[PDB]
Amino acid sequence: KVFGRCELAAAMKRHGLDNYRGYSLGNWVCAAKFESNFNTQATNRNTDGSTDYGILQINSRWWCNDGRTPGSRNLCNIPCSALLSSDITASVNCAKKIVSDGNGMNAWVAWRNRCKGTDVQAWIRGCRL
Ligand SMILES: [Br-]
Ligand SMILES: [Br-]
Ligand SMILES: [Br-]
Ligand SMILES: [Br-]
Ligand SMILES: [Br-]
Ligand code: NA
Numbered sequence: 321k322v323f324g325r326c327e328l329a330a331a332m333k334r335h336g337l338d339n340y341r342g343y344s345l346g347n348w349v350c351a352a353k354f355e356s357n358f359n360t361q362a363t364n365r366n367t368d369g370s371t372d373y374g375i376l377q378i379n380s381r382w383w384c385n386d387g388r389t390p391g392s393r394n395l396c397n398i399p400c401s402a403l404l405s406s407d408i409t410a411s412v413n414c415a416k417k418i419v420s421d422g423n424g425m426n427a428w429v430a431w432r433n434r435c436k437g438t439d440v441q442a443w444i445r446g447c448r449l
Contacts, residue, residue, distance in 0.1 A: 321406035323358040323375070325349065326447035328408075333449055335412040341419050345449075346440035347431065348415075352376055353443070354430035360411075361404050374403035374411045376428065383414055 323331070329349050332338065338345040355377040356362035364372045370381035370389045378396070380389040386400035396414035403411050418427050425431045 321360045323352075323360070325353075325358070325443065326449075328352060328358055328375075329444045329447050330449060331408055332412065335409065337412060337415075340416060341424065343419065343425055344440065346443040347425060347435060349443040350435035350438070350440045351425065351428050351431040354434045355428060360406055360408065363404070371400065373400045374405075375408055376411050376415050377430075378403055378411065378414055378418070383418065 329345055332348050333345060337343075337348050352358055352375050356375045358375065360375050362374065362377065364377065366372065366379070368381065370379050370392065371386055372379050373384065373386070378384060378400075380386045380400050381392045383394070383396045384398050384400035384403060385392070385394040396417055398410055398414065403414065419425055421427070425436075
């Protein structure tokens with residue numbers, strides 16, 4: 321599924337992401353835009369052999385199992401394929417663990433480089449929330 325901007329905002333809000341660990345909704349929508357272009361089916365392989373999955377590009381080295389990342393953990397206790405569903409519940413729950421592990425949303429490189437310190441509220445402007 322490719323989400324619309326306001327559609328994703330509303331889905332994230334319903335799943336408790338608005339102001340989760342102090343990050344306003346616009347941060348999460350901005351990160352999803354530049355990580356996956358709002359596409360739940362996005363995948364990207366990294367040079368170390370791990371793969372990033374889904375709307376928030378969650379990495380297989382630490383967070384999910386994809387059966388092909390040898391030295392890896394599965395901290396969200398899910399198959400990586402569950403992160404590609406049109407239902408974002410799995411991605412959101414896992415993201416909540418990630419953002420809580422100490423480094424905040426800096427775990428998402430695109431957020432750091434393209435959202436951090438910008439007017440992120442712009443990403444939910446005009447939306448019915
Ligand atoms: Br957009
Ligand atoms: Br915001
Ligand atoms: Br594995
Ligand atoms: Br959903
Ligand atoms: Br933080
Ligand atoms: Na893994």
